[PDB]
Tab-separated table of C-alpha atoms in Angstrom:
chain	number	residue	atom	x	y	z
A	1	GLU	CA	-6.477	-156.517	174.451
A	2	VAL	CA	-7.276	-153.232	176.361
A	3	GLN	CA	-4.024	-152.289	178.247
A	4	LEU	CA	-3.436	-149.407	180.756
A	5	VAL	CA	0.192	-149.110	182.038
A	6	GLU	CA	0.766	-146.532	184.875
A	7	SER	CA	4.374	-145.269	185.495
A	8	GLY	CA	6.108	-142.448	187.486
A	9	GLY	CA	5.121	-143.686	190.991
A	10	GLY	CA	7.724	-143.552	193.799
A	11	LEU	CA	9.054	-141.869	196.975
A	12	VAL	CA	8.722	-138.024	197.218
A	13	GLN	CA	9.276	-135.339	199.947
A	14	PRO	CA	6.120	-133.758	201.501
A	15	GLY	CA	5.421	-130.404	199.725
A	16	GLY	CA	6.995	-131.966	196.598
A	17	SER	CA	5.636	-132.917	193.139
A	18	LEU	CA	5.409	-136.027	190.904
A	19	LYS	CA	3.946	-136.681	187.397
A	20	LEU	CA	2.114	-140.036	186.749
A	21	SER	CA	1.573	-141.370	183.147
A	22	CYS	CA	-0.847	-143.934	181.635
A	23	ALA	CA	0.155	-145.631	178.310
A	24	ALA	CA	-3.151	-146.849	176.711
A	25	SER	CA	-3.654	-149.314	173.786
A	26	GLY	CA	-6.409	-151.565	172.299
A	27	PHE	CA	-9.126	-148.811	172.204
A	28	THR	CA	-9.638	-145.537	170.216
A	29	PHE	CA	-8.140	-143.359	173.015
A	30	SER	CA	-9.578	-139.906	171.991
A	31	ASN	CA	-13.273	-141.076	172.257
A	32	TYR	CA	-12.832	-142.235	175.937
A	33	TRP	CA	-12.836	-140.132	179.177
A	34	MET	CA	-9.700	-141.072	181.289
A	35	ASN	CA	-10.022	-141.093	185.148
A	36	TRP	CA	-7.603	-141.444	188.110
A	37	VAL	CA	-8.706	-143.428	191.219
A	38	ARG	CA	-6.368	-143.991	194.211
A	39	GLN	CA	-6.302	-146.394	197.238
A	40	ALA	CA	-4.419	-145.929	200.559
A	41	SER	CA	-3.264	-149.240	202.201
A	42	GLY	CA	-6.214	-151.323	203.599
A	43	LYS	CA	-8.777	-148.561	202.698
A	44	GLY	CA	-11.459	-147.582	200.131
A	45	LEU	CA	-11.300	-146.584	196.449
A	46	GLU	CA	-11.181	-142.748	196.128
A	47	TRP	CA	-11.977	-140.974	192.801
A	48	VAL	CA	-9.305	-138.345	191.891
A	49	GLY	CA	-10.665	-136.842	188.645
A	50	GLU	CA	-11.601	-137.189	184.973
A	51	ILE	CA	-10.582	-135.560	181.659
A	52	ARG	CA	-13.156	-135.657	178.803
A	53	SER	CA	-12.499	-135.922	175.007
A	54	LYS	CA	-11.318	-133.025	172.703
A	55	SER	CA	-14.983	-132.618	171.534
A	56	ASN	CA	-15.663	-131.718	175.262
A	57	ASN	CA	-12.758	-129.164	175.256
A	58	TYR	CA	-10.679	-131.604	177.435
A	59	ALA	CA	-12.859	-130.546	180.433
A	60	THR	CA	-11.427	-131.716	183.816
A	61	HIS	CA	-13.194	-132.424	187.165
A	62	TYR	CA	-11.426	-133.168	190.535
A	63	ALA	CA	-12.293	-134.630	193.981
A	64	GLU	CA	-12.493	-131.918	196.729
A	65	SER	CA	-9.402	-133.450	198.492
A	66	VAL	CA	-6.994	-132.764	195.502
A	67	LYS	CA	-8.543	-129.699	193.640
A	68	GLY	CA	-5.850	-126.977	193.132
A	69	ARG	CA	-2.913	-129.439	193.639
A	70	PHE	CA	-3.491	-132.207	190.996
A	71	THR	CA	-3.728	-131.650	187.161
A	72	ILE	CA	-5.029	-134.307	184.691
A	73	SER	CA	-4.109	-133.885	180.994
A	74	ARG	CA	-4.022	-136.169	177.911
A	75	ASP	CA	-1.954	-136.595	174.696
A	76	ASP	CA	-4.186	-138.318	172.078
A	77	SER	CA	-1.209	-138.694	169.618
A	78	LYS	CA	0.801	-140.742	172.245
A	79	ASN	CA	-2.409	-142.484	173.606
A	80	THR	CA	-1.372	-141.320	177.157
A	81	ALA	CA	-3.074	-139.633	180.185
A	82	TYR	CA	-1.219	-137.836	183.064
A	83	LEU	CA	-1.669	-136.843	186.744
A	84	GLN	CA	0.623	-133.924	187.801
A	85	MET	CA	0.639	-133.791	191.647
A	86	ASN	CA	1.841	-130.635	193.552
A	87	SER	CA	2.031	-129.713	197.297
A	88	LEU	CA	1.909	-133.512	198.022
A	89	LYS	CA	1.020	-134.506	201.650
A	90	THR	CA	1.355	-137.859	203.562
A	91	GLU	CA	-2.516	-138.213	203.211
A	92	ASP	CA	-1.934	-138.525	199.369
A	93	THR	CA	0.079	-141.783	199.934
A	94	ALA	CA	-1.701	-144.499	197.906
A	95	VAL	CA	-1.726	-146.723	194.796
A	96	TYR	CA	-2.915	-144.537	191.836
A	97	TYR	CA	-5.051	-146.223	189.117
A	98	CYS	CA	-5.757	-145.068	185.525
A	99	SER	CA	-9.232	-145.868	184.025
A	100	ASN	CA	-10.960	-145.298	180.646
A	101	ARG	CA	-14.140	-145.876	182.837
A	102	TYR	CA	-14.280	-149.606	181.700
A	103	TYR	CA	-10.769	-150.966	182.651
A	104	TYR	CA	-8.130	-150.157	185.291
A	105	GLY	CA	-4.334	-150.442	184.981
A	106	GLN	CA	-2.306	-152.548	187.466
A	107	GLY	CA	-1.661	-149.320	189.522
A	108	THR	CA	1.491	-147.407	190.720
A	109	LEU	CA	2.354	-146.505	194.375
A	110	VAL	CA	3.097	-142.895	195.452
A	111	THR	CA	4.719	-142.614	198.925
A	112	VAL	CA	4.967	-139.069	200.426
A	113	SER	CA	7.575	-139.359	203.247
A	114	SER	CA	10.851	-137.701	204.438
A	115	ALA	CA	12.144	-141.258	205.186
A	116	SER	CA	15.117	-142.472	203.050
A	117	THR	CA	15.071	-145.223	200.361
A	118	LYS	CA	16.623	-148.496	201.651
A	119	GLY	CA	17.274	-151.782	199.775
A	120	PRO	CA	16.270	-155.105	201.409
A	121	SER	CA	18.367	-158.073	202.609
A	122	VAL	CA	17.136	-161.486	201.227
A	123	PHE	CA	17.511	-164.489	203.662
A	124	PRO	CA	16.518	-168.153	202.998
A	125	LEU	CA	13.768	-169.917	204.991
A	126	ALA	CA	15.482	-173.339	204.596
A	127	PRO	CA	13.352	-176.520	204.543
A	128	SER	CA	14.043	-178.893	207.538
A	129	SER	CA	15.213	-182.564	207.642
A	130	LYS	CA	11.772	-184.305	208.101
A	131	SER	CA	9.841	-187.152	206.301
A	132	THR	CA	6.273	-185.594	206.118
A	135	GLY	CA	5.718	-185.587	202.184
A	136	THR	CA	5.049	-181.799	201.981
A	137	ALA	CA	8.035	-179.442	202.646
A	138	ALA	CA	7.844	-175.621	203.249
A	139	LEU	CA	10.662	-173.154	202.253
A	140	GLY	CA	10.772	-169.400	201.572
A	141	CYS	CA	12.557	-166.048	201.507
A	142	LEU	CA	12.576	-163.318	204.142
A	143	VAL	CA	12.885	-159.903	202.353
A	144	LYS	CA	13.992	-157.788	205.366
A	145	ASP	CA	14.476	-154.028	206.107
A	146	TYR	CA	13.295	-152.044	203.032
A	147	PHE	CA	11.596	-148.667	202.366
A	148	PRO	CA	9.415	-147.759	200.646
A	149	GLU	CA	6.926	-150.378	199.356
A	150	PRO	CA	6.694	-152.364	197.241
A	151	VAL	CA	8.854	-155.499	196.676
A	152	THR	CA	7.683	-158.205	194.202
A	153	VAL	CA	8.529	-161.935	194.723
A	154	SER	CA	8.307	-164.737	192.106
A	155	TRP	CA	9.700	-168.308	192.408
A	156	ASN	CA	11.848	-169.863	189.599
A	157	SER	CA	11.160	-166.835	187.281
A	158	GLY	CA	7.354	-167.346	187.614
A	159	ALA	CA	7.207	-171.081	186.632
A	160	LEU	CA	6.443	-172.093	190.305
A	161	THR	CA	3.058	-170.568	191.453
A	162	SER	CA	1.095	-173.494	193.062
A	163	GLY	CA	1.407	-173.597	196.904
A	164	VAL	CA	3.010	-170.054	196.919
A	165	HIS	CA	1.979	-167.614	199.704
A	166	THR	CA	3.443	-164.072	199.596
A	167	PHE	CA	2.460	-162.434	202.919
A	168	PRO	CA	1.664	-158.713	203.138
A	169	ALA	CA	4.637	-156.500	204.207
A	170	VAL	CA	4.710	-155.647	207.948
A	171	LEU	CA	5.886	-152.167	209.027
A	172	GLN	CA	8.583	-152.927	211.693
A	173	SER	CA	9.301	-150.772	214.832
A	174	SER	CA	12.258	-149.103	212.908
A	175	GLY	CA	9.825	-147.757	210.201
A	176	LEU	CA	11.302	-150.296	207.660
A	177	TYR	CA	9.160	-153.001	205.897
A	178	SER	CA	9.712	-156.776	206.061
A	179	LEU	CA	8.042	-159.467	203.894
A	180	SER	CA	8.017	-163.325	203.683
A	181	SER	CA	7.289	-165.594	200.694
A	182	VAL	CA	6.862	-169.378	201.271
A	183	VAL	CA	5.988	-172.328	199.006
A	184	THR	CA	5.015	-175.912	200.017
A	185	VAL	CA	6.584	-178.501	197.613
A	186	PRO	CA	6.834	-182.349	197.519
A	187	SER	CA	9.494	-183.472	200.116
A	188	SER	CA	11.079	-185.834	197.476
A	189	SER	CA	11.990	-182.808	195.198
A	190	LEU	CA	14.335	-181.184	197.818
A	191	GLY	CA	17.507	-182.922	196.441
A	192	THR	CA	16.783	-182.394	192.706
A	193	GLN	CA	14.530	-179.312	192.012
A	194	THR	CA	16.252	-175.872	192.427
A	195	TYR	CA	14.058	-173.328	194.325
A	196	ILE	CA	15.000	-169.665	193.612
A	197	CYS	CA	13.072	-166.608	194.848
A	198	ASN	CA	13.398	-163.533	192.574
A	199	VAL	CA	13.089	-160.362	194.745
A	200	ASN	CA	12.854	-156.902	193.101
A	201	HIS	CA	12.781	-153.580	195.072
A	202	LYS	CA	12.671	-151.024	192.189
A	203	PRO	CA	12.746	-147.931	194.511
A	204	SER	CA	16.295	-148.919	195.800
A	205	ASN	CA	17.345	-150.525	192.428
A	206	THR	CA	17.727	-153.971	194.177
A	207	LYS	CA	17.319	-157.296	192.235
A	208	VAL	CA	18.190	-160.578	194.097
A	209	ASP	CA	17.883	-164.278	193.092
A	210	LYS	CA	18.106	-166.321	196.366
A	211	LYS	CA	18.514	-170.134	196.063
A	212	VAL	CA	16.702	-171.711	199.081
A	213	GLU	CA	17.977	-175.280	199.842
A	214	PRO	CA	18.196	-177.652	202.835
A	215	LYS	CA	20.933	-176.594	205.319
A	216	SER	CA	23.961	-178.936	205.880
V	1	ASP	CA	-21.350	-134.455	197.491
V	2	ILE	CA	-23.624	-137.538	196.873
V	3	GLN	CA	-23.023	-140.186	199.637
V	4	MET	CA	-23.036	-143.897	198.706
V	5	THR	CA	-23.496	-146.094	201.844
V	6	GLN	CA	-23.181	-149.866	201.102
V	7	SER	CA	-24.848	-152.624	203.235
V	8	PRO	CA	-23.298	-154.606	204.695
V	9	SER	CA	-19.637	-153.519	205.420
V	10	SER	CA	-18.550	-157.214	205.373
V	11	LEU	CA	-20.399	-160.498	204.733
V	12	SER	CA	-19.584	-164.202	205.348
V	13	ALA	CA	-21.393	-166.695	202.992
V	14	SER	CA	-20.928	-170.370	201.916
V	15	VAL	CA	-19.849	-171.495	198.384
V	16	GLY	CA	-23.083	-171.699	196.264
V	17	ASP	CA	-25.106	-169.206	198.398
V	18	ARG	CA	-27.021	-166.384	196.718
V	19	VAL	CA	-25.200	-163.208	197.958
V	20	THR	CA	-26.979	-159.777	197.921
V	21	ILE	CA	-25.320	-156.327	198.581
V	22	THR	CA	-27.296	-153.008	198.670
V	23	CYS	CA	-26.006	-149.416	198.107
V	24	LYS	CA	-28.072	-146.333	199.230
V	25	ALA	CA	-27.493	-142.991	197.346
V	26	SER	CA	-28.280	-139.861	199.519
V	27	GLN	CA	-29.935	-138.266	196.360
V	28	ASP	CA	-31.580	-139.543	193.113
V	29	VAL	CA	-28.769	-140.846	190.770
V	30	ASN	CA	-31.157	-142.394	188.181
V	31	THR	CA	-29.385	-145.554	186.776
V	32	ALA	CA	-25.908	-143.799	186.829
V	33	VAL	CA	-24.415	-146.394	189.290
V	34	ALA	CA	-21.537	-148.862	188.626
V	35	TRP	CA	-20.387	-151.973	190.595
V	36	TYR	CA	-16.705	-153.021	191.052
V	37	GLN	CA	-14.922	-156.183	192.285
V	38	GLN	CA	-11.397	-155.762	193.786
V	39	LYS	CA	-9.743	-159.167	194.494
V	40	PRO	CA	-6.706	-158.996	196.886
V	41	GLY	CA	-3.582	-157.333	195.312
V	42	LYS	CA	-5.456	-156.651	192.000
V	43	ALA	CA	-6.906	-153.603	190.142
V	44	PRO	CA	-10.629	-152.791	190.444
V	45	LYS	CA	-12.669	-154.706	187.780
V	46	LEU	CA	-15.921	-153.053	186.460
V	47	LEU	CA	-18.775	-155.637	186.709
V	48	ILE	CA	-21.994	-153.553	186.292
V	49	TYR	CA	-22.696	-150.003	184.981
V	50	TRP	CA	-26.018	-148.222	184.168
V	51	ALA	CA	-27.219	-149.986	187.403
V	52	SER	CA	-27.935	-153.287	185.480
V	53	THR	CA	-25.656	-153.572	182.361
V	54	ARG	CA	-23.078	-156.406	182.655
V	55	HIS	CA	-19.601	-155.303	181.321
V	56	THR	CA	-18.281	-157.672	178.545
V	57	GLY	CA	-16.607	-161.017	179.589
V	58	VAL	CA	-18.033	-160.684	183.203
V	59	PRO	CA	-19.796	-163.883	184.451
V	60	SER	CA	-23.672	-163.953	184.243
V	61	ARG	CA	-23.785	-164.977	187.994
V	62	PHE	CA	-23.206	-161.214	188.750
V	63	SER	CA	-26.236	-158.883	188.363
V	64	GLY	CA	-27.265	-155.351	189.376
V	65	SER	CA	-30.709	-153.697	189.680
V	66	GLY	CA	-32.034	-150.349	191.017
V	67	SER	CA	-33.212	-146.885	189.908
V	68	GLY	CA	-33.288	-143.605	191.906
V	69	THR	CA	-31.597	-144.033	195.351
V	70	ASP	CA	-31.684	-147.855	196.023
V	71	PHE	CA	-29.432	-150.339	194.115
V	72	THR	CA	-28.640	-154.072	194.563
V	73	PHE	CA	-25.671	-156.255	193.567
V	74	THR	CA	-26.349	-160.011	193.414
V	75	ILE	CA	-24.096	-163.074	193.053
V	76	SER	CA	-26.500	-165.941	192.150
V	77	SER	CA	-24.079	-168.789	193.169
V	78	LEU	CA	-21.014	-167.625	195.201
V	79	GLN	CA	-17.797	-169.216	193.798
V	80	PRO	CA	-14.484	-169.593	195.701
V	81	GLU	CA	-12.762	-167.018	193.364
V	82	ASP	CA	-15.410	-164.337	194.274
V	83	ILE	CA	-13.492	-163.487	197.525
V	84	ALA	CA	-13.033	-159.678	197.083
V	85	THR	CA	-14.228	-156.210	198.216
V	86	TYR	CA	-17.241	-154.916	196.168
V	87	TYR	CA	-17.713	-151.184	195.419
V	88	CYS	CA	-20.722	-149.116	194.282
V	89	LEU	CA	-19.988	-145.755	192.550
V	90	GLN	CA	-22.357	-142.861	191.592
V	91	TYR	CA	-21.530	-141.122	188.215
V	92	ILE	CA	-24.564	-138.721	187.772
V	93	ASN	CA	-22.800	-135.515	189.084
V	94	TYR	CA	-19.169	-134.512	189.697
V	95	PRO	CA	-17.549	-135.374	191.992
V	96	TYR	CA	-17.980	-139.171	191.377
V	97	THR	CA	-18.178	-140.981	194.793
V	98	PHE	CA	-17.459	-144.624	195.827
V	99	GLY	CA	-19.239	-146.499	198.625
V	100	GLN	CA	-17.030	-147.683	201.561
V	101	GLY	CA	-17.104	-151.199	199.930
V	102	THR	CA	-18.412	-154.633	201.105
V	103	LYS	CA	-15.732	-157.250	202.058
V	104	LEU	CA	-17.000	-160.723	200.955
V	105	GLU	CA	-15.501	-163.704	202.941
V	106	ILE	CA	-16.423	-167.437	202.396
V	107	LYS	CA	-17.589	-169.831	205.218
V	108	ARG	CA	-16.107	-173.357	204.840
V	109	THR	CA	-15.320	-176.410	207.029
V	110	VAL	CA	-12.524	-176.213	209.669
V	111	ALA	CA	-8.985	-176.874	208.293
V	112	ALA	CA	-6.098	-177.250	210.785
V	113	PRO	CA	-2.833	-175.406	209.932
V	114	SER	CA	0.362	-177.120	208.817
V	115	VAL	CA	3.057	-175.507	211.071
V	116	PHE	CA	6.755	-175.098	210.134
V	117	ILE	CA	9.574	-173.368	212.068
V	118	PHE	CA	12.603	-171.681	210.358
V	119	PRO	CA	15.899	-170.864	212.091
V	120	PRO	CA	17.716	-167.629	211.141
V	121	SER	CA	20.250	-168.037	208.268
V	122	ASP	CA	24.019	-167.849	209.027
V	123	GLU	CA	24.005	-164.978	206.450
V	124	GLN	CA	21.643	-162.832	208.655
V	125	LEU	CA	23.534	-163.519	211.978
V	126	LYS	CA	26.522	-161.663	210.378
V	127	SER	CA	24.187	-158.539	210.526
V	128	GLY	CA	23.785	-158.798	214.373
V	129	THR	CA	19.995	-159.659	214.147
V	130	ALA	CA	18.198	-163.069	214.175
V	131	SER	CA	14.739	-163.600	212.563
V	132	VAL	CA	12.911	-166.879	213.455
V	133	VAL	CA	9.798	-167.614	211.346
V	134	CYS	CA	6.686	-169.728	212.166
V	135	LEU	CA	4.442	-170.618	209.123
V	136	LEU	CA	0.760	-171.627	209.710
V	137	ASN	CA	-0.333	-172.879	206.237
V	138	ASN	CA	-3.847	-173.393	204.776
V	139	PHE	CA	-6.119	-173.147	207.837
V	140	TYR	CA	-9.729	-172.036	208.514
V	141	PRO	CA	-11.056	-170.171	210.326
V	142	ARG	CA	-8.714	-167.097	210.569
V	143	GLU	CA	-8.497	-166.982	214.442
V	144	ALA	CA	-5.070	-168.552	215.330
V	145	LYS	CA	-2.827	-168.075	218.425
V	146	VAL	CA	1.002	-168.186	217.938
V	147	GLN	CA	3.223	-168.255	221.066
V	148	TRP	CA	7.053	-168.058	220.856
V	149	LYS	CA	9.203	-169.697	223.580
V	150	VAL	CA	13.033	-169.400	223.913
V	151	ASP	CA	14.460	-171.831	226.560
V	152	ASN	CA	10.916	-171.939	228.076
V	153	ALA	CA	10.496	-168.119	228.239
V	154	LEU	CA	7.310	-166.816	226.491
V	155	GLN	CA	8.399	-164.035	224.042
V	156	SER	CA	6.079	-161.001	223.994
V	157	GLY	CA	6.508	-157.747	222.008
V	158	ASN	CA	9.412	-159.055	219.779
V	159	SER	CA	7.197	-160.678	217.061
V	160	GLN	CA	4.956	-159.570	214.140
V	161	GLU	CA	2.345	-161.591	212.185
V	162	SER	CA	1.034	-161.301	208.601
V	163	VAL	CA	-2.139	-163.122	207.328
V	164	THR	CA	-2.799	-163.641	203.575
V	165	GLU	CA	-6.339	-163.039	202.252
V	166	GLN	CA	-8.590	-166.127	201.796
V	167	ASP	CA	-7.215	-168.416	198.989
V	168	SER	CA	-9.161	-168.101	195.658
V	169	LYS	CA	-9.572	-171.968	195.368
V	170	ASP	CA	-9.660	-173.548	198.913
V	171	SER	CA	-10.818	-170.444	200.937
V	172	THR	CA	-7.964	-171.030	203.512
V	173	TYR	CA	-5.798	-168.403	205.319
V	174	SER	CA	-2.019	-168.641	205.807
V	175	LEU	CA	-0.116	-166.810	208.627
V	176	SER	CA	3.623	-166.110	209.178
V	177	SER	CA	4.998	-164.987	212.603
V	178	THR	CA	8.551	-163.464	212.777
V	179	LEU	CA	10.448	-163.319	216.149
V	180	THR	CA	13.297	-160.735	215.934
V	181	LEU	CA	16.191	-161.158	218.441
V	182	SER	CA	19.710	-159.663	218.653
V	183	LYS	CA	22.386	-162.226	217.532
V	184	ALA	CA	23.814	-162.042	221.134
V	185	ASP	CA	20.369	-162.949	222.657
V	186	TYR	CA	19.921	-165.736	219.999
V	187	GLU	CA	23.435	-167.275	220.612
V	188	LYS	CA	22.776	-167.385	224.458
V	189	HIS	CA	19.689	-169.736	224.079
V	190	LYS	CA	19.150	-173.331	222.831
V	191	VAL	CA	15.405	-174.228	222.326
V	192	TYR	CA	13.295	-172.217	219.796
V	193	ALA	CA	9.541	-173.129	219.764
V	194	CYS	CA	6.321	-171.724	218.278
V	195	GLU	CA	3.124	-173.255	219.741
V	196	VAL	CA	-0.039	-172.991	217.563
V	197	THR	CA	-3.586	-173.050	219.004
V	198	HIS	CA	-6.370	-173.506	216.392
V	199	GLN	CA	-9.965	-174.919	216.368
V	200	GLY	CA	-8.907	-177.750	213.924
V	201	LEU	CA	-6.213	-179.114	216.321
V	202	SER	CA	-7.390	-181.397	219.221
V	203	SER	CA	-4.531	-179.795	221.247
V	204	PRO	CA	-1.790	-177.171	220.652
V	205	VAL	CA	0.902	-178.184	218.068
V	206	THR	CA	4.558	-177.188	218.774
V	207	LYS	CA	7.405	-177.027	216.200
V	208	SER	CA	10.933	-176.361	217.503
V	209	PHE	CA	14.688	-176.538	216.828
V	210	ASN	CA	17.814	-176.371	219.004
V	211	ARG	CA	20.273	-173.659	217.812
V	212	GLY	CA	23.005	-175.643	215.907
V	213	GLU	CA	21.072	-178.929	216.710
C-alpha cells in the first residue's frame, strides 16, 4: 500500500547534472522525512541525505561525498521528493533509492560516462534435439550501453525455472546479458516461448520467439 | 563520522541454523540503530529499528538487540529465502552511516549441474561475430570449471562467465559461459565443446555440437 516510484535516472556526461524524483503514495507524505540512499554495482549502501518536514523548516543534511553538489527538496502537494545532482563524477555512478525511512522504492540507475548510448541485439539460445525430459532455451541480449536491460518470458506468465544472469562488461566497454529457462521437453512443439527485452536508455523493445532450429 | 563495522563480512550457514550478526559503533549511538535485508536485485527492506523494534509485516524469526556501541541481529531459524546482504545503520547524528554489510550464503548438499550448449544463431553470424553459450544449471557448491574447445584447441581469453546469486528456494547457483569468435574463425572449425568439472560429477561432463551438424 506504501509506494515509492523513482524516475529521472539515466546516462549523463561527467561534470553534468540530473534531477531524480520520487512519487509517494499510501502515507501522509508531509509528516515523514524523505532520504536518498545509493548503491554502486557489487558494493555497499551509501546514505546521500535527508529532508525533514515543513514543521522542521525542510532542514536538509548530506553525506560528505555529495555536499555542495546534490540538493534534496520536497513538494508536499504533489507527494514527491527530489535529488538535484550537479558536477556529477564517475564515482557517483549507482542505483539511487528513495526512502521515507521505513520503505525503499525499486531504485533508478544513474550512469556518469562519456560513452554513447547503444541498443542491444537479441539472439535466440535455441533448445537442442535431445530426449532428456527437461529442455533449456534462452535469449542473448548482446552489445548494449548503459545498464540496465529487463527480461521477462511470455509477458511475465513464465517465471519458474527462469535464470537471468548478471550483465558482463565486455572488452569493447559494451554490456551483454543471457536469460535462460528450463521447460518440459514435451512442450517444445506446442508452447510458444518469447523473451521480452527492454533497454529504455536506447528506446529498444524486442519480443524474441525462441524455438527449436530446423 | 560514526563508523559501523559489521561482523562477519560474509557467513555460510545451513537451513534451520540460528544465525547471529554483530555491528560495532565507534561511539555511543544509544538504540538509534536499524537493520536492513537486501535480497539480490531488490530494494533494501527495513527489518529492525530502535535496535530491537520489528518493522510491520517482517517475520518474527528476525530480531535485534543492543544499546550503546554493541548491537546484534539474529535469525532464529535460517530459511532458504533469507539469502541476502544484511546492513546495520546508525541514525543518532548526521551523517547517517551504513555498515559494510554481511553477505549470508546457505550451506546445502552437493548438486551436480545440468549442462547445455548453444550454437550461435544464423541471425548473429550476419553481424560477423559468433557467440557460443554453455549453461551450468542448478548446482552447488559455486566452484565450477568451464573449458571451451574448438576442434580440440582449448580456448583461453575469448570467454566470459556470469553466476546468478543462490536461488531463494533450492539454494543452487547457475552459471553461463559465452565464447565470442569472429564469424570467419567460427566457419573454419567443426567441433564446439564445453567441458564442465564440478564436485557433484564423478568425472567431467562434455556437451558439444558440430557446426551445421
